[PDB]
Amino acid sequence: MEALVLVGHGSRLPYSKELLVKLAEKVKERNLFPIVEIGLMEFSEPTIPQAVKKAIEQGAKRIIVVPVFLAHGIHTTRDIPRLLGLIEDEHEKLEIPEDVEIIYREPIGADDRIVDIIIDRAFGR
Amino acid sequence: MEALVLVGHGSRLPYSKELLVKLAEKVKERNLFPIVEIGLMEFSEPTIPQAVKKAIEQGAKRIIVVPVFLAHGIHTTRDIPRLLGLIEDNEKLEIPEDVEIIYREPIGADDRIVDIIIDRAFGR
């Protein structure tokens, strides 16, 4: 079965995980994916290696990794695709079995729907 | 006069500013705000103090500051509101007495974000 892993930055504060948890609930309710997991790059659990390994353990053969970041940065272009084994080079460590494929997706970017949210927020809504 | 100031994290890489620039053009095209400026918390320029000051200079007495961040973090709960003069503390933003700053809320777990995430999952 396919899995979605949502991946976030992580924070010293708990808002970043809380955001990822809520988003995962919302996408679970769209019934697109049997398995939906979250990972945080830094600070808190679950880690990205932990989330990938938890989706393999549920028997996922195709894992979609969506970086929930607004723009590309060091995490989206280096730290994350390294962990997932997609580009080369005491860490975490993630082994990916041969029959598992990781599909690393694109961040949010300057999407029109973000300008919608910006306008709502401008009016305190 | 109503300025909207979009405020972002900033990074050592240039993509974060590029995102703020692009979003500011896109909100300009909605024609809701006469003045639209961007500021970056860290690393990049313009700074948040620089952006707010450059809105005052164009004569806005109402400046809306919208945090373009997914979740709250230390910048949105401490650094940005300190800078704007809305909380106590203990390169310098003045803020004249005839201008009001309205600090808004970050993006959060909006339904539109889950729509974007689903698009991104299928590679659109």
The reply to whether residue B121 touches residue A111, judged by beta carbons under 8 angstroms, is no
Task: Give chain B positions within 8 Å (CB) of A115.
Answer: 23, 26-27, 30
Number of domains comprising chain A = 1
Q: Which domain covers residue A90, as residue numbers?
A: 1-125
Both structure tokens of B69: 């961040």
Q: Which residues pair with B39 in a beta bridge?
A: B7
B15/chain A closest Cα distance in angstroms: 6
Task: Give chain A positions within 8 Å (CB) of B37.
Answer: none
Answer yes or no: are the C-beta atoms of A93 and A49 closer than 8 Å: yes
How far is residue B118 CA from its own chain's centroid?
26
Question: Assign residue B122 a region: left if phi > 0, alpha if psi is -120 to 50, beta otherwise?
Answer: alpha
CA distance A44 to A12: 8
Q: By C-alpha distance, which of B61, B72, B50 is closest to A13?
A: B72
Q: Distances in Å between the alpha carbon of A65 and those of A68, A97, A106? A: 9, 16, 9
Both structure tokens of A68: 């929930």
CA distance B120 to A76: 14
Say whether A90 sits in a helix, a strand or coil.
Answer: coil
Strand order from edge to edge, sheet including A101-104: A35-40, A2-8, A62-67, A101-104
Task: Give chain B positions within 8 Å (CB) of A74.
Answer: 11-13
In units of Å, what resolution does this entry have?
A: 2.6
CA distance B10 to B27: 19
Does the CA dihedral B50-A121-B122-A96 come out positive or negative? positive
Q: Distances in Å between the alpha carbon of A102 and those of A3, A5, A82, B65? A: 10, 10, 12, 39
Out of A26, A106, A116, whose CB is closest to B120?
A106
Q: Which long-range contacts (CB under 8 A, 24 or more apart) does A24-29 make?
A: A26/B109, A26/B111, A26/B114, A27/B114, A27/B117, A27/B118
Q: Which residues pair with A3 in a beta bridge?
A: A35, A63
Q: By C-alpha distance, which of B117, B3, B38 is closest to A111?
A: B117
Q: B45: annotated binding-site residue?
A: yes
Q: How many beta carbons lie within 10 A of that of residue B122, not counting itself?
A: 9
